[PDB]
Amino acid sequence: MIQPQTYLEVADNTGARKIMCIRVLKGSNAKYATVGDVIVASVKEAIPRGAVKEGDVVKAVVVRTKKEVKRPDGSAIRFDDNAAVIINNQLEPRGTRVFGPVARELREKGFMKIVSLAPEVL
Template sequence: MIQPQTHLNVADNSGARELMCIRVIGASNHRYAHIGDVIVAVIKEAVPNTPLERSEVIRAVIVHTRKELKCDNRMIIRYDDNAAIVVDQ
């Protein structure tokens, strides 16, 4: 469960290393984002000499969450970190 002010690792090679969630995209009453949801985030840490810079506002898709995801076949999926992938605007 990702909510505003949550820090996430970046799971792609876009040049960003760490993000902070600003807003969960969707209905106005969505408080938390889960795997597959789109968020608005700000870059907190980036690799030097890449197109993405620190304090840039971007969109990202959640791919890992520490909170477990329960499937219909009694399977539980849990990751060690919260991570997202940067999406083109």
């Protein structure tokens, strides 16, 4: 769930399904990369022509594969770790992202539009 640099799944606008991470985005000390958060990271894997290409980027969480809790104690695990991508402060580059409904995601409520864009199966 938490990460400095690591292998973490991008599943977004990279030309391949991975991004290397860099770290947590806000509190100096924190270590832990909690969900519902934006992050610094980079792809390591390849692309088909595409656009985003190699370089550096700042962007956000999806899932965890390491224990959430809800205030209503809803719970939901997943042996996989995709996470969101963003341009600028906020807006989402790719207008495409396959993914499901899910819970914690919108709850930061800084980026409501996304929710529509990744609703589906698998």
